């Protein structure tokens, strides 16, 4: 009974930034989802396309555990049909998304008196991200018709902005850690199941 690596994805010292969001493929294991609902510690827990209860009796080709960090009042944007700074230039979710969104408050870890600027997000981009698309470009956002040649001034803006996480911030300003599970059903081996593990 290979136990899927959810201890490594959720309980993880360092998380990525949202524009540069982590991904962790999951295959060839038995996925105990019971811990993830029975927890009750997470502030956001909603799945799309499938009821969570009937997931132990389910099998999939691969699970994709995207894991990143955003400020409190941005978790609403991790959902189908959502818009805003994060959902368009950092991490977009498709309309037909089939998976779960899980997030918990991490101000006791990702903040620091003075401000933990370690985490970033994307301010400007040529256009919106396609679903599940990543953008790690540090190209200086040309905000005029005059090119910037790789340094910022007027009409030139380093597109990555920071997060001033302080433990006194408002909740809508405090850091949260989001884990976006994506479920995959290909005409394929389907090598990940939950508790009902009588087939191998």
């Amino acid at each position: 009974t290979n136990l899927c690596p959810f201890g490594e994805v959720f309980n993880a010292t360092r998380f990525a930034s949202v524009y540069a969001w982590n991904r962790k493929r999951i295959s060839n294991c038995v996925a105990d989802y019971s811990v993830l609902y029975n927890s009750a510690s997470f502030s956001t827990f909603k799945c799309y396309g499938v009821s969570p209860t009937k997931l132990n009796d389910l099998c999939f080709t691969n699970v994709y555990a995207d894991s990143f960090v955003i400020r409190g009042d941005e978790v609403r944007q991790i959902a189908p049909g959502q818009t805003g700074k994060i959902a368009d230039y950092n991490y977009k979710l498709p309309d037909d998304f089939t998976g779960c969104v899980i997030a918990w408050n991490s101000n006791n870890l990702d903040s620091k008196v003075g401000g933990n600027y370690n985490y970033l997000y994307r301010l400007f981009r040529k256009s919106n991200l396609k679903p599940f698309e990543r953008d790690i470009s540090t190209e200086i956002y040309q905000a005029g018709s005059t090119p910037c040649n790789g340094v910022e001034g007027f009409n030139c803006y380093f597109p990555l902005q920071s997060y001033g996480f302080q433990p006194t911030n408002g909740v809508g300003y405090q850091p949260y850690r989001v884990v976006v599970l994506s479920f995959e059903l290909l005409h394929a081996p389907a090598t990940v199941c939950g508790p009902k593990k009588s087939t191998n």
Partner: antibody
Amino acid sequence: EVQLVESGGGLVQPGGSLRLSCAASGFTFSSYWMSWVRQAPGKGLEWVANIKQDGSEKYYVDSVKGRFTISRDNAKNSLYLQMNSLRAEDTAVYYCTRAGWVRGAFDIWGQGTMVTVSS
Amino acid sequence: NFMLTQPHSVSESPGKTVTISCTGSSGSIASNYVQWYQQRPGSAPTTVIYEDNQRPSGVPDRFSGSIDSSSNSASLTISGLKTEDEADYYCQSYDSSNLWVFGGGTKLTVLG
């Protein structure tokens, strides 16, 4: 076929004790969380307590925290609510419900038992 | 301090469509699942809608849950009303600080 049957309600003057008990049937009791939801007559619904499906974690409302103790015997398919140091506001109908993970979906509702606290 | 607040009473004709709102007070509705419970007088509550828009087996097509991303609010909607639907309707969700919060309830009166 799911059914829940609450017992052990009635009248008790303030500051007294009383023990509720709700009998499960027709489902795997060891596989659900169990909650008590009360409803003062003519008023709305209020959640009271929830207990994990081994009996490890227990949660309550601040109104009853310290005075109400929730428990369960998975073998005997029964949920309990030890209500001690009662008040007048505790007067309500006390339902027992299946919820099922922890996040909602209070699936089934028993018919309830009356609890009157009057001096 | 995350209250759910819904109006006191709504009403409509024998056939009509009617919509009961449920707006969060401090915290995001659609940060967690939103249920809807029907309760006729003296009876125990029953679940008409679970997991945001979803209805249990046995509940007619007329009931339909939804979640407004704008107003921070969910809404129950009953297309093609029936006098049997006259009841009180409570919305309910969960929040990590105030566990298992409930709405005020709303009396849906089918105008006879």
